[PDB]
Design a protein around this ligand. Structure first.
Ligand SMILES: CCCCCCCCCCCCCCCCCC(=O)OC[C@H](COP(=O)([O-])OCC(O)COP(=O)([O-])OC[C@@H](COC(=O)CCCCCCCCCCCCCCCCC)OC(=O)CCCCCCCCCCCCCCCCC)OC(=O)CCCCCCCCCCCCCCCCC
Ligand code: BCL
Ligand code: BCL
Ligand SMILES: C/C=C1/c2cc3[nH]c4c(c3C)C(=O)[C@H](C(=O)OC)c4c3nc(cc4[nH]c(cc(n2)[C@@H]1C)c(C(C)=O)c4C)[C@@H](C)[C@@H]3CCC(=O)OC/C=C(\C)CCC[C@H](C)CCC[C@H](C)CCCC(C)C
Ligand SMILES: C/C=C1/c2cc3[nH]c4c(c3C)C(=O)[C@H](C(=O)OC)c4c3nc(cc4[nH]c(cc(n2)[C@@H]1C)c(C(C)=O)c4C)[C@@H](C)[C@@H]3CCC(=O)OC/C=C(\C)CCC[C@H](C)CCC[C@H](C)CCCC(C)C
Ligand SMILES: CCCCCCCCCCCCCCCCCC(=O)OC[C@H](COP(=O)([O-])OCC[N+](C)(C)C)OC(=O)CCCCCCCCCCCCCCCCC
Ligand SMILES: COC(C)(C)C/C=C/C(C)=C/C=C/C(C)=C/C=C/C(C)=C/C=C/C=C(C)/C=C/C=C(\C)CC/C=C(/C)CCC=C(C)C
Ligand SMILES: COC(C)(C)C/C=C/C(C)=C/C=C/C(C)=C/C=C/C(C)=C/C=C/C=C(C)/C=C/C=C(\C)CC/C=C(\C)CCC=C(C)C
Ligand SMILES: COC(C)(C)C/C=C/C(C)=C/C=C/C(C)=C/C=C/C(C)=C/C=C/C=C(C)/C=C/C=C(\C)CC/C=C(\C)CCC=C(C)C
Ligand SMILES: COC(C)(C)C/C=C/C(C)=C/C=C/C(C)=C/C=C/C(C)=C/C=C\C=C(C)\C=C\C=C(/C)CC/C=C(\C)CCC=C(C)C
Ligand SMILES: COC(C)(C)C\C=C/C(C)=C/C=C/C(C)=C/C=C/C(C)=C/C=C/C=C(C)/C=C/C=C(\C)CC/C=C(\C)CCC=C(C)C
Ligand SMILES: [Fe+2]
Lengths: 247, 54, 281, 43, 305, 54, 54, 43, 54, 43, 54, 43, 54, 43
């Protein structure tokens, strides 16, 4: 087949390369269409549908069957924010930021945003809660690191905010997820473990100042935390980085 | 021999039918490619030789 | 314009240079100070590439090439049509890359996420700077860099490799290749596993991370986890790029001969140097 | 016994049909080898 | 300041035996030891491993392949442990000489033992592919891993089985050595002109660099949004949270377009299977259709001519 | 002998049948490849030489 | 022979039969390949030599 | 034993069937080796 | 001697038997390969030389 | 003591059967070595 | 002396037995290979030379 | 004390049988070395 | 001896015994390999020279 | 002290048996060195 061309310089290599270009165009189209299953249709900044929607048409719906009788999820589907957003326009023209009306960490906007996830705890493959306090978890213990229980907690303002009392553990993955921190008023808050640095004699939280620890959203049941509570806590703690820069 | 029908008792017909379609087509294509590769049994070339098409 | 959830995240803050100035979007893109800088540098580089194509006399995009100055110029300026355009485009490309990284930092701190992505990008920028700045500067000329062409920078790769015989005898090269292959394998396995859990057999419920853990524990006897697999992917990619940069920086600066000859230190170890057998004996 | 759940009678019947298939395949193969050996022997 | 690269506290509980969807539990083993180093980076638990019939087949054939190559290396060393350690990476099983073609009549020292080892390796790899398919099926999952592995197998088969048959000689195949198969790739590029000018070589390199790029991007993104529990992606698919939203908005404000928590994995799997698939095509084309890739590039507008 | 029917009380006929089919096909393909590879027993070129088609 | 039947009180017969099948097939193929590899005992080449095939 | 759950009678019958199969296989192997050795001895 | 039977109260007979089978087969294969690689004791070549097979 | 769950009697019988198998295997190996040594002594 | 048995209250017998068996086999193989690689004590070669096998 | 856990009377019997095995193994080794030294001494 | 018995108050016997065994074996192997590497004291070569084995 | 859990008498007895083992190993090494020095001295 060496040198055997159908026409011009077109041989099996040229046939293969053009076939691959057509396949690659089709595959990119498929991949983008599959990407388009969340956040669409596009909106105007006043909430209405946008005149311009994009070159790629919206894919056909597909359905997930959630485990443990949690239901089904059809995407793309009718998605609403379902929460009030305390933001104000700074310009009539589009493309400009929206300014917080009040306290952005309290209101949950910007880097302090949270999503209205399900108000149920996340489950493992057996139906039990995925995340449990280490006292509830039977047979769990701290293995090979600096044990944080009892260490003082220090905010970004060089002041003590409380002490670590428990560790919340992801039972299936066998990893630590949250630090339970008791404040001065005898109330416990949860801090994401990705947001604290465990030092030799303290736990440092750079995102949050000592006073702001009081405003962390709490959990309604001491023995478990739901997905909505995880979003609220993590959004608050992460937004502390931008909205607690002074002090 | 008169009772081979019970094979469909144990095999899903749809998987079997798809599998044998793929198998038969691949086998036919392979045999045709083998025949074309050999200088003999390349029917186009031997017809060209037979009809003096240079 | 906006995603269904995008509105609450567009807030006025997190810039590095400037304030409300440049704190706006153009369509989907965020354009800060470094967005303006990135756009300027990228447009300048692209127009200069087209003008170099005009100068060279070809319009075929696969034949367009922008060559570095010849070795007789050393580390000084060159005429525009004889290496100056390459230098200007290199400055523009460096500026575009660094401004892109800084723009990503601004987006990271507007969204409240960590700066892993700009760090990972900086690794690639350092590999590019190794090939285009550090190695030519140590070697003494801009002509040891590679040209800006689709098929001629591959000629640079071929000539540079074959100067030192067969190039995959360079040890750091071996490490970099191993990391690249392992990374592609890990990416395929990871994507396939996540998809298979999210897309089970027809009519089944979605699988859980326990099913993924069980699948790889059944297959190979070990599961690294979700956090583990993402850490592994980041580190595999960065280690590949780091070791490629190393193997190139030591190539014309410390080593000068065939690398297959470098591997003779192991053979000539005193306690088996002279044993009469095998390949080297 | 309990490995598959097939009754003894069921196993006997399945084995009979399977052996019919095996004998058919082997007879075709034997005829094939006879014909090839007559055409061009390998011993 | 914590970058979530290494765990700072490590916790252990009862070992997890796994799911029981329809797996034959008699074919599993026990849990192995826990490892603190792996715990620092990822999971500490080792095992349990499934070993069924396809596992026995794969283990036997792969063990025989490894043993055959090792015993040949010991023969080359002269049964000398010192020479075996010294000239390790220099030993090789070579395929038959070009005079023998595809015939199975080459002697054991010349190319027969290479054929024996190749049969063992073929059986081992195909049985391992079957094992990946069946392990996905037992748990009720999709077979994405099986088809990605099939792409990798396609490149392996082209290199070792399909192209030697089209070329009509076993000598076209790869030797079993460390430096020897590297020399094989160099000589392959030299004999066929310049493999840089194979366009499917270029696509394969594009998709290898793309795998590195994409999976640095994706690992960095998941690590960046893991403060919101982003690494638990299977539930971010079912219940979109602030982590997935922030990731999508980062990439949309950066490069104009984004993905989902599942579409990015589709991108990933395709970006890797494409490197191996295009590589297989490009290798199959070399020598059978194009004997000189630089001249092909000159005729196809890629080289100045 | 004559008790060999009892293997089906040990093995699931579905798995055995699929494995047997793939094994038989692979063995046949392997033996045909062996025969085609040798200059003798390549029936295509034997017929080509015998009928002087080259 | 004497009391070896008690082996089946220790080992699951399914595993034993599968291991035997795999081992026996792989061993037979290896021996046949070794015989084909020797210039003697390669029945195809020596039949070709003794019948003047090539 | 408790390792596999077969009783003494089940094990004895299983071994009888297994040994019949083994002796058939070995008989065929011996006949093949005798044929090859008459055709081409290796000693 | 008389008291060795107590090894089985320490080691699982199943695991021991599997490891022992693998060990014995690999050892035997290695010794046969070593003999084959040796000019003498290569019984195939010895028979080829004695009967003038080549 | 009985880490495997086998008592003294089970272990004694297991060892008896294993000894019988080992001595059979060793007798076959001894005869093979005797034949090879007569055919071609290595000392 | 006379109280070395207490070592078994320090070490788990099965782990020690596995390690000891692996160690002994590896040592024996290493010594046999060392003796094969030496031109002296290569029993195959010296037997070949004594009996004129080459 | 028994860290792995064995009574002193279990340890004594395990050591007695282990010594039996060690002495048998080493006696076979002595005989092998004696044979090799007679055949081909290394001193 | 005098007071050294108290080292075992400090070090766990399993760790010490394992490390000691590994250390003693590696030391013995290293000394043996050093003696083999010198042309003198290489007991294999000097016995060959003494008995004229080459 | 409480690092390992061995009391005084246990540590003393353990050291006694350990020293017995050390002296046996040393005596074997001394005999080996004497034999080697008689055969081929290094001083
Ligand atoms: C005109 C020329 C141009 C041609 C094309 C132009 C046409 C226009 C453009 C068309 C492009 C469309 C691209 C979109 C595809 C995306 C589909 C997708 O991902 O999801 C849907 C679907 C499943 O979606 P899902 O939602 O995840 O399902 C979940 C299920 O519930 C549960 O899961 P499941 O059990 O159902 O299976 C899950 C899996 C399932 O999808 C599959 O089943 C794939 C089947 C394997 C691939 C087929 C090749 C195998 C050989 C044939 C023997 C088996 C055939 C029967 C397969 C059994 C199917 C029942 O889905 C995946 O996502 C796997 C992704 C990775 C697949 C990689 C396969 C590479 C194998 C390498 C083969 C190399 C040998 C030959 C190489 C080429 C020869 C030169 O997956 C597919 O359909 C995969 C399509 C496979 C494409 C094969 C590749 C073509 C290669 C051609 C290269 C270009 C030629 C240039 C060279 C020319 C030389 C002369
Ligand atoms: C990395 C070490 C070597 C090198 C070795 C090779 C080899 C070897 C090959 C390439 C190939 C390519 N290289 Mg190069 N390449 C180098 C430096 C670069 C740089 C750079 C500024 O540093 C760039 C932009 C490129 C660009 C490219 C593309 C033309 C092509 C596919 C890459 C790809 O998809 O990657 C992954 C990235 C993505 C998938 C994202 C999308 C990126 C797109 C495709 C880039 C287009 C750039 C455009 C042509 C130019 C600017 C305007 N190379 C250095 C000198 N490169 C292959 C090819 O086909 O060449 C013809 C090839 O065979
Ligand atoms: C002088 C050398 C030549 C050259 C010669 C070749 C040749 C020849 C080939 C490549 C191939 C490739 N080359 Mg090139 N290459 C050159 C220069 C480059 C440069 C560069 C910057 O210069 C780059 C980046 C590349 C990159 C690439 C890759 C994209 C591609 C290999 C994919 C892969 O993963 O293979 C590795 C993966 C596999 C082989 C798949 C393995 C799958 C099987 C199933 C694994 C079995 C494992 C076994 C059971 C293991 C037991 C393990 C134990 C269990 C642990 N080449 C120059 C021009 N290159 C290949 C290709 O496809 O080209 C089109 C190829 O064959
Ligand atoms: C270190 C681990 C991997 C790694 C990592 C990451 N990589 C990242 C990120 C991370 C984490 C990002 O965050 C960032 C991004 O947003 O991604 C979508 C980025 C990006 N990786 C690009 C390309 C890329 N990554 C490569 C390699 C790896 N990446 C390694 C393997 C390779 C090759 C050759 O392998 C290529 C080609 C762009 C797509 C994009 C920058 C766009 C830009 O800067 O725009 C601004 C600039 C332009 C739009 C054009 C400027 C043109 C100049 C003036 C003229 C140039 C001409 C040129 C010299 C001609 C050559 C012929
Ligand atoms: C997308 C393209 C990528 C990719 C794809 C995939 N690759 C997969 C899968 C996918 C998707 C699997 O599902 C499968 C698997 O299980 O993964 C855990 C597999 C595997 N890829 C292996 C090797 C490998 N992949 C390479 C490359 C890439 N692969 C490219 C980049 C390279 C090189 C050279 O770069 C190598 C060496 C083995 C580890 C393993 C098979 C083991 C085997 O066959 O054992 C059978 C063989 C043995 C058991 C022999 C053992 C011998 C003694 C005991 C030692
Ligand atoms: C060359 C002409 C490109 C524009 C062609 C055209 O008529 O579109 C007008 C439009 C009018 O602007 P538009 O954004 O209002 O229209 C888009 C409406 N949807 C998305 C719903 C279809 O111009 C474009 O949108 C160009 C967008 C990018 C096109 C890049 C192609 C490469
Ligand atoms: C290099 O090596 C060379 C090539 C030189 C030689 C190496 C060679 C070897 C090792 C060859 C191996 C040859 C072997 C071992 C062949 C085995 C052949 C067999 C075992 C064939 C059996 C075929 C049986 C077949 C097709 C059965 C057909 C049965 C049927 C259609 C009917 C089954 C239907 C059943 C319906 C189920 C219904 C019953 C119920 C109760 C529902
Ligand atoms: C390079 O070095 C070279 C190769 C040159 C030389 C180096 C050589 C070495 C190091 C050789 C080592 C040789 C060894 C160490 C050999 C050991 C061989 C053994 C240990 C063989 C065992 C044979 C035992 C056999 C087959 C088992 C017979 C067992 C049986 C049938 C099993 C029956 C037991 C039963 C069934 C269960 C009873 C059940 C109840 C309920 C009572
Ligand atoms: C390069 O260096 C060269 C090669 C030149 C030389 C360098 C050499 C070295 C460093 C050589 C090392 C030589 C050594 C140190 C060898 C180790 C020899 C030993 C100490 C071997 C142990 C032999 C003990 C053996 C086989 C044990 C047989 C034991 C048994 C069956 C034990 C039975 C245990 C039982 C049954 C269960 C009973 C249970 C109850 C409850 C009663
Ligand atoms: C002391 O150490 C011992 C001896 C115990 C073991 C140590 C062992 C060593 C040192 C093992 C060496 C392993 C190595 C160095 C392996 C090299 C593996 C490589 C690197 C292979 C590289 C490319 C190989 C490629 C593509 C193979 C493709 C092979 C194929 C598709 C298989 C083709 C199957 C077919 C050809 C032949 C068809 C014939 C029949 C009968 C089906
Ligand atoms: C050329 O020179 C080079 C460069 C190679 C190096 C030159 C020199 C060196 C640096 C040589 C190193 C020489 C050394 C430092 C050797 C160390 C030798 C030792 C420390 C040997 C200890 C031997 C002790 C032995 C075998 C004791 C084993 C003890 C036992 C059986 C007794 C244990 C039994 C027990 C414990 C039960 C315990 C009781 C209860 C109630 C639990
Ligand atoms: Fe992911």
């Amino acid at each position: 087949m060496v040198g055997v061309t159908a026409f011009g310089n077109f041989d099996l290599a040229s046939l293969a390369i053009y076939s691959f270009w057509i396949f690659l165009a089709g595959l990119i189209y498929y991949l983008q269409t599959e990407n388009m299953r969340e956040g669409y249709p596009l909106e105007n900044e006043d909430g209405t549908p946008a005149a311009n929607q994009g070159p790629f048409p919206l894919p056909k719906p597909k359905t997930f069957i959630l485990p443990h009788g949690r239901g089904t999820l059809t995407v793309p589907g009718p998605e609403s924010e379902d929460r009030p957003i305390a933001l104000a326009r700074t310009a009539v023209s589009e493309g400009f930021p929206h300014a917080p009306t009040g306290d952005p960490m309290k209101d949950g906007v910007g880097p302090a945003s949270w999503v209205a996830r399900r108000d149920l705890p996340e489950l493992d493959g057996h139906g039990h809660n995925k995340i449990k306090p280490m006292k509830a978890a039977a047979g769990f213990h701290v293995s090979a690191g600096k044990n944080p229980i009892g260490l003082p907690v220090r905010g970004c303002d060089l002041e003590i905010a409380g002490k670590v009392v428990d560790i919340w553990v992801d039972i299936p993955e066998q990893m630590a997820r949250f630090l339970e921190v008791e404040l001065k008023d005898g109330s416990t808050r949860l801090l994401p473990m990705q947001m604290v640095k465990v030092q030799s004699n303290r736990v440092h939280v750079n995102a949050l100042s000592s006073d702001l620890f009081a405003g962390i959203p709490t959990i309604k049941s001491p023995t478990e935390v739901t997905l909505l509570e995880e979003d609220k806590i993590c959004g608050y703690v992460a937004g502390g980085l931008m909205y607690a820069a002074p002090k | 021999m008169s009772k081979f029908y019970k094979i469909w008792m144990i095999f899903d017909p749809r998987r079997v039918f798809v599998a044998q379609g793929v198998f038969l087509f691949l086998l036919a294509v392979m045999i045709h490619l083998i025949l074309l590769s050999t200088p003999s049994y390349n029917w186009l070339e031997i017809s060209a030789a037979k009809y003096n098409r240079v | 314009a906006l995603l269904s959830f995008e509105r609450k995240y567009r807030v006025p803050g997190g810039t590095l240079v400037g304030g409300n100035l440049f704190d706006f979007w153009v369509g989907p893109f965020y354009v800060g100070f470094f967005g303006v800088a990135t756009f300027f540098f990228a447009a300048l580089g692209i127009i200069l590439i087209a003008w170099s194509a005009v100068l060279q006399g070809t319009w075929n995009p696969q034949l367009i090439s922008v060559y570095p100055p010849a070795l007789e110029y050393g580390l000084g300026g060159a005429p525009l049509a004889k290496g100056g355009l390459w230098q200007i485009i290199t400055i523009c490309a460096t500026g575009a890359f660094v401004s892109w990284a800084l723009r990503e930092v601004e987006i990271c701190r507007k969204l409240g996420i960590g700066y892993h992505i700009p760090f990972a990008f900086a690794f690639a920028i350092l590999a590019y700077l190794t090939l285009v700045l550090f190695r030519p500067v140590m070697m003494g000329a801009w002509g040891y860099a590679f040209p800006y062409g689709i098929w001629t920078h591959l000629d640079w790769v071929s000539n540079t490799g074959y100067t030192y015989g067969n190039f995959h005898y360079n040890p750091a090269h071996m490490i970099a290749i191993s990391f690249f292959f392992t990374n592609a394998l890990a990416l395929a396995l990871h994507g396939a596993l996540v998809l298979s859990a999210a897309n089970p057999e027809k009519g089944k419920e979605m699988r859980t991370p326990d099913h993924e853990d069980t699948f790889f524990r059944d297959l190979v006897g070990y599961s690294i986890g979700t956090l583990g697999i993402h850490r592994l992917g980041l580190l595999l990619s960065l280690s590949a790029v780091f070791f490629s940069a190393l193997c190139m920086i030591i190539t014309g600066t410390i080593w000068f001969d065939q690398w297959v000859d470098w591997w003779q230190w192991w053979v000539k170890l005193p306690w088996w140097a002279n044993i009469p057998g095998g390949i080297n004996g | 016994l309990g490995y598959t759940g097939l009754t003894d009678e069921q196993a006997q019947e399945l084995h009979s049909v399977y052996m019919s298939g095996l004998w058919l395949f082997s007879a075709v193969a034997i005829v094939a080898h006879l014909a090839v050996y007559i055409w061009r022997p390998w011993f | 300041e914590y970058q979530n690269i290494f765990s700072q506290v490590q916790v252990r509980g009862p070992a997890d035996l796994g799911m029981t969807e329809d797996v034959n539990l008699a074919n599993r083993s026990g849990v192995g030891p826990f490892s603190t180093l792996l715990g620092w980076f990822g999971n500490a638990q080792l095992g349990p491993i499934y070993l069924g019939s396809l596992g026995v087949l794969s283990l036997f054939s792969g063990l025989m392949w490894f043993f055959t190559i090792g015993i040949w290396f010991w023969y080359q060393a002269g049964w000398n442990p010192a020479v075996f350690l010294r000239d390790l990476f220099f030993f090789s099983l070579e395929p038959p000489a070009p005079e023998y073609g595809l015939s199975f009549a080459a002697p054991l020292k010349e190319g027969g033992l290479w054929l024996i080892a190749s049969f063992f390796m073929f059986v081992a790899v195909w049985s391992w592919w079957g094992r990946t398919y069946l392990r996905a099926q037992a748990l009720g999952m999709g077979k994405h891993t099986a088809w990605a592995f099939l792409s990798a197998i396609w490149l392996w088969m082209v290199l070792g089985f399909i192209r030697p048959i089209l070329m009509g000689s076993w000598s076209e195949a790869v030797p079993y050595g460390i430096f020897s198969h590297l020399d094989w790739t160099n000589n392959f590029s030299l004999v066929h002109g310049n493999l840089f000018y194979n366009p499917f070589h270029g696509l394969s390199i594009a998709f290898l660099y793309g795998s590195a790029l994409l999976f640095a991007m994706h690992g960095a993104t998941i690590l960046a949004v893991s403060r919101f529990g982003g690494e638990r992606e299977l539930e971010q698919i079912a219940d979109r949270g602030t982590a997935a939203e922030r990731a999508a908005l980062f990439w949309r404000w950066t490069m104009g377009f984004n993905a989902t928590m599942e579409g990015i994995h589709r991108w990933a799997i395709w970006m890797a299977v494409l490197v191996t698939l295009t590589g297989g095509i490009g290798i199959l084309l070399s020598g059978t259709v194009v004997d000189n890739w630089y001249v092909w590039g000159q005729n196809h507008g890629m080289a100045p001519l």
